[PDB]
């Protein structure tokens, strides 16, 4: 029952997700290098709500860059992408960060009454 989410672990001030992992992920369909191999490599970690209190997140790897005034300089994890904070129906809104939030909630409710093809085998 503990809700958690995956995050990219961070070294001293660097991601552990090197370019070799992206390379093996690009040919995911040939070399059967999958998400579980990414987790087993110690590059990704599932962090729950209670362990997030002890975690210092980077919103993007740009936060790990050394800046004229360092904000943290001791990050421990990084977001895979901030847009993953949204759910299924809010992930259909284009440019949801340019709307008033009630509008995004009303769309998230109204994407569910929208017509389409609810399922491919609707004939049976």
């Amino acid at each position: 029952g503990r809700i958690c989410r995956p995050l990219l672990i961070v070294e001293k001030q660097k991601l552990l997700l090197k370019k070799r992992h992206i390379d093996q992920l690009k040919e995911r369909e040939y070399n059967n290098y999958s998400w579980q191999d990414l987790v087993a490599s110690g590059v990704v970690e599932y962090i729950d709500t209670l362990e997030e209190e002890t975690v210092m997140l980077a919103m993007t790897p740009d936060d790990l860059q050394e800046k004229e005034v360092a904000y943290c300089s001791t990050y421990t994890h990084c977001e895979i992408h901030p847009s993953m904070i949204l759910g299924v129906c809010a992930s259909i809104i284009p440019f949801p960060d340019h709307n008033q939030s009630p509008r995004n909630t009303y769309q998230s409710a109204m994407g569910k009454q929208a017509m389409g093809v609810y399922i491919t085998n609707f004939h049976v």
């Binding site: 209190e53 002890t54 975690v55 210092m56 943290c72 300089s73 001791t74 990050y75 421990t76």
Partner: protein, 117 residues
Amino acid sequence: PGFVGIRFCQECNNMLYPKEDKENRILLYACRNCDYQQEADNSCIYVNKITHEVDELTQIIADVSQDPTLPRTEDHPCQKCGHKEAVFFQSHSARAEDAMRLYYVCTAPHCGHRWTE
């Protein structure tokens, strides 16, 4: 003034309660379970700090310097070891209104000096 601690009997290990000996006109600490008595050495039985003038440096522990989520600064070096980096944080403790005060801790391992500006 300082607080007064609880003291226990030497036989039943129950707490000693205060009592007065009229014969010598002297304070005693006696157990109401066994029949033990002791000559007090503080003469003070109760202390209430209504002002709550607590030194929060005593509540801090050096281990907090290992917290990745605390801010670090290079501007306040340690007076005990000379390390440059140090974590800082606010009181965040109830019963402390002027809690914007910052407390610093040295991040050098095994030094753990704590102070306040």
